[PDB]
Subunit: 443 residues, 4 copies
């Protein structure tokens, strides 16, 4: 691993902060969605979550104790702009200022996600990402971000996982705001998000220099073998998309951002209400960017011909049900490097485990250690084969609100007892600490 | 029946007009919704419908031939304001001008519905009835209506059946735009629609004098007997509503419009994102109105205690599946008269039949004749017992696009062969003609 | 097909009929020692039937036999198609005969003979005795022997007076809806291999039943299929061939509702080709002796036709026309179905055809004038019979036509929400009112369809 | 209950066991004349099982008997609980015994005796012979006689060497999931009256099986229930009473998954009161002779306990705590269930209890070090056994505890996605790796639980 390699841990505003209805914070779509009967596992919500808004100091101390180089967090748009535009809320700004000072004080590099799915409710009432002005709303947010944090923060990510907040939010309907919209409206929302990204980059370039990223949800295709043919088939499957399956793919989002073009098929869709995609739109979307964010939890194995192989019977898996596929943190970085020739940051990687406090009062998560050890060995091999990887962020610092699954999935290197809000560092946290101290030399 | 009694027939823009993408007409939510896979019976849509935009003269001639006193139609908001606000489309205005001249020329009183569910798509993209400004959008529409039609049209209905376009549009999701929103969002939309109504009334009062109505979907409770006790129980059931069942009720919509108050329970709901309902809102909503529109197709029988009785085994029914309950056109008018002390117009009454062209080349609909005869006898009895009823509009002039059921339900007194667009007046049309000629004396 | 001549019209001996089924009309479900059937239990299960309707009472025809026979006489009907309740005559489905049950059908058959009406007896119209269901129903190896025992009791007690038998009504529906889709009793959704097992047991049951019905008095025996005829795009030889091929097609993923899957075994002594190649877990062993038992000689093919589907030049199903004339149950009106169905079935099997059911669900009510006006049913009947007449003209041997139904009745999972009757039934009073269609049909019978 | 005091701990003769079931481990589904069972057919139906998994091969334990017996020896297990495949020893479920089938279980039982391991034989762990399903399965009046014939064959061929029998494993699940919810074979959703009929036929089957198992060698006979114990809000007499009452409650709308519905008939010779008042169509006739047959004397009550539910002072079920410790199958970890379940069952029936199943699904894998580390399973086992120990201390007679399971295996509708084993199985190679939990359990057995 490089000497400057960003050894990180990651969170998101709604998943940890709590204090949902305090200090003039505006409603977001997850406040409303999570309160709707039957949207969340056992009607869990992020009203309180890890109460991190009120326990900032303790969590910064855990970050210091683990020896984490970088902290990836999201800003609550609705906390800093309660109506999403206009009046800034300084109590909101103050929280993130106090966070960023805490980080600088401890020599931890801030990595700021602008959008981790908590759209201000006031903007949702105006049609959210269906609204022609939604890119301008986001630009205004991005300008406020640079204004108040541009001095101290030099790492920005515009959007976390558009695949999920657009796919699950507006196509499948299992995430806020919980819609199932026609293809034309999905493409309209995707285009408004990508243009929002363009305007946000422009805003973030005004003043202090910084590194700006775009984070994709990625399920890398793992080749059947090292044979050139099998590798090519995996590459092709990985970057494929069509009118009936695009919103969850890499190419549909990354080609516009990095190559300034949508996949071929997008030009041929003539559905009623399809948005007008102009050359100026594509030039706005494809602003120069410093790194590609990859959120990789697992991949899929493909045959010689790039067909997806049946998951092996009894494949090692996680508490959320996903398979453990170590090679995903090799092939995902590699193929993304080959396609876009950009520095890669693993902005999320981690595992849901059925964690508990043992009789000895500790949290033993050997499955998470093995997952982390296996995946980091593969990331190491990718760096060895010439993939430029600038860092790796463990999802997550804390067990937290896992969206439609509520608190039923624990991704943390730190356990949270929700009765007391007690943090207990898991074996995985101490294991990760050793990796950072040794810059991954002993994996 | 009174000498001035408005013997009418009714239509709606999207159900008959066609010409969906012509003469600068803007998209509406039904253009987009009806083109979504699986939203409509056999993917029917109103692209062409009865092609009434292009066959206006023939349909006016059928109106004349039947001897209809009044014609109830809706204006396509998206035809006269393609983006829903700003630029008026005069080709759109011209169509309705030509309709209204055709009506005046034939001595037929125009009854103009402003909103029959075809929300401009541009406003939907801005959040539709969730948007704070949606009442102002509607006011702007209502002002354009009065401006261009206030001279010739003296009968206006702001909203047709908010129960259905809000309930089916945004709660059950079977109507455009096809959402299933939490209670708080339904109340927000209801409040925005009722305020829209207030602003629209104010707009329609500026200039020529006119009669303005509000039309409710009504399923009247029919008492077990003429006993005072049973009648009281039916009245109470009819005007009941609660937090878990309100959007399809009469009182939830009519109390705000006519009494300037929501039902008691509404004040006590504190759900996340609930709108703030102010005394000024309630005063805006409760503008003075000239008649109550009732769309009555059937009612429900209630026991002595106002509990809804199981439908009788083999109850006479219609091709859409609804029961035939003749007394509904007595008790609905009567209870609405008793509660609000306002003139009533039956703005819709009619029956879906499995109509076809017989071997003799005619359309025989005796079931529709019997339905109409039975229901009008009950309306006559209501007038006799002192209910002020100013008119009755047969739904519909033409077989048409019956929303999520497409063309599978025929409500017309005129048959439409969709292969040729040929109109054939049904036996019911000639029966209705005789009723109008005889002012219902021979029922 | 060789034309017969257009002049002749309907034959002079043509069986002008009306049809019913036991569970749909009889009521008296728990009386005179009658055993439970699968529809008694299924219809009492929450949410199985429209508004939890059941056939406990139905048209109370068990108790109003005389009035209904008088309506049959008044209409001048040549033949009456009815089903025997297996569970009424054999309450446990085998062993002890119930003579109170036998007595009812004796009294019916005497009433018919007395009025010069030819009885047409359906043995099985879906009301499997519950005692046999508890023994696995049509999954049981012995189910064909249970049915044989039933068919023997039928011939024993009714063979003297009844000379027209139908073993099974619409196996497509009682097997497809009963055991694949699960919307009919007993309401199962079984794998393909179990559907084939049940189909095979039903077809063997049919074989044994034919053998039983041949012992003693001579009779005409039929097998009734649910048929949705493919209507060709045009009269072009190519389009007709494509429709014929689509109509008689079947495969492992779509067979239970087809004609060929049921009729090839009965009439040709073979299943479609694909059946021999299926090796699914639990597949039944289909032997040459099974196929010979199934293919007993039969006198007519019963067709229950309500509508068909229009197919393109290549036999692909065409989109239904926008606003196509339809019925109260939602089905389209497709008059040519009662031409092409009889014709293709005649061409394939070279057998006499009886239209064992044809009719229309209408939203019927008692008008202010106290009558039931069903012009839509008249037009449906007139249009369909014109097409049947044309089929006879083009050389299809058609021995009769049974209007579904004599009475409005219990329409299975739809309960009393669908009225198929030429006679209206008010379920509050059990009053019968003959509809306009009944008087229209009377005129057709009187004139042997000469004026259609 | 009279206390023993905490010092003594587990009895000296305490049966430290591990458990399996035939279909979940054996494989060899279509070999050595083995008949089809309902799980062979159900698991081959599209979409019935997670990723269309099936038990065709499972852990291939039929072919790897010796290796698994060696793991049993190495762990030092006192008792092995396994099920006999009915369809392996009687391919048509009755009549012709299959000696190749008998031979397998003979070789198993010899392997066990040879290693000083006490066999605990489950007759029925859900694999109903398919031939009997075709005859209506547990709906058939004769189903108890089919089971008696099976139980007679069991005693005949294994009565010499096996002195521990369990008639039925978890009727709650094979009846509830098999015939009410429909997520288990045969996958039906039957009315209440059919569920009661099946329950009654199963309980009578149990009666006849006990009678059969008493003929010849002396033996201990059990009945195993699926139990979700109610855990009281506190130690207050009133909160404990409310939990006891909730735990043993049942009514017409919620009975099939309860303890009392199954155990009252078996142990007290009566159904809950409400059963006598149900008059649903097709309800079976429950006679005093039926109840006397069902309530044959038995030696122990089997409890399969994985977790319980927390109840308030009034016995109402409390909302599960936010982030409650849970397992890979999604169930909560509720340690006190293995106290309160044994205790309340002891108080109600005054019978010896065996924990016939207890264990945890974990997301287990082979670590980089080539071992399987399952500390969550160790903690689960340690916590639950501490609670069982406390129950023994407070005077509950507990004769043994069987860890579910010896091997990771086919977890029914979840396929191989849930690993319950103290031994890991790589399904690609069929390699067994003993997990940390296996070595932890070995130490507990060696020390008779003295160090818990």
């Amino acid at each position: 691993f490089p000497k400057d390699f960003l050894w990180g841990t990651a969170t998101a505003s709604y998943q940890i902060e709590g204090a949902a209805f305090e200090d003039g914070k505006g409603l977001n779509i997850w406040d409303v969605f999570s309160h709707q009967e039957g949207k969340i596992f056992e009607n869990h919500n992020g009203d309180v979550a890890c109460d991190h808004y009120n326990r900032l100091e303790e969590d910064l101390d855990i970050l210091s104790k683990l020896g984490v180089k970088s902290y990836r967090f999201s800003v609550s748009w609705s906390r800093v702009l309660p109506a999403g535009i206009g009046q800034v809320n300084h109590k909101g700004i103050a929280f993130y200022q106090m966070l960023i000072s805490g980080l600088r004080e401890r020599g931890i590099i801030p990595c700021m996600t602008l959008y981790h799915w908590d759209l201000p409710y006031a903007l949702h009432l105006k049609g959210g990402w269906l609204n022609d002005d939604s890119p301008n709303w986001f630009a205004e947010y991005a300008k406020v971000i640079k204004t108040y944090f541009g001095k101290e923060v030099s790492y920005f990510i515009t959007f976390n996982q558009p695949q999920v907040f657009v796919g699950c939010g507006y196509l499948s309907g299992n995430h806020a705001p919980g819609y199932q919209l026609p293809k034309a409206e999905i493409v309209r929302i995707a285009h408004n998000v990508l243009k929002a990204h363009g305007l946000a980059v422009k805003e973030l370039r005004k003043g202090e220099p910084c590194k700006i990223g775009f984070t994709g949800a990625s399920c890398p295709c793992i080749p059947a073998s090292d044979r050139k043919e099998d590798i090519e088939a995996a590459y092709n499957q990985y970057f494929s998309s069509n009118s009936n399956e695009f919103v969850f793919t890499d190419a549909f989002w990354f080609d516009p951002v990095l190559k300034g073009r949508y996949p071929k098929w997008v030009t041929y869709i003539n559905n009623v209400s399809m948005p007008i995609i102009t050359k100026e739109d594509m030039e706005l979307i494809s602003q120069p960017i410093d790194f590609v964010g990859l959120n990789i939890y697992n991949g899929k194995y493909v045959n010689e011909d790039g067909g997806i192989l049946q998951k092996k019977q009894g494949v090692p898996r996680t508490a959320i049900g996903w398979p453990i596929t170590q090679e995903a943190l090799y092939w995902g970085p590699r193929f993304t490097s080959e396609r876009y020739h950009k520095p890669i940051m693993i902005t999320e990687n981690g595992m849901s485990c059925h964690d508990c406090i043992s009789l000895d009062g500790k949290v033993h998560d050997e499955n998470r250690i093995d997952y982390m050890h296996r995946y980091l060995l593969q990331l190491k091999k990718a760096i060895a084969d010439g993939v430029d990887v600038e860092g790796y962020y463990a999802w997550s610092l804390l067990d937290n609100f896992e969206w439609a699954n509520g608190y039923n999935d624990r991704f943390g290197i730190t356990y949270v007892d929700y009765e007391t809000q007690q943090r207990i560092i898991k074996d995985s946290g101490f294991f990760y600490q050793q990796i950072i101290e040794t810059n991954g030399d002993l994996l």
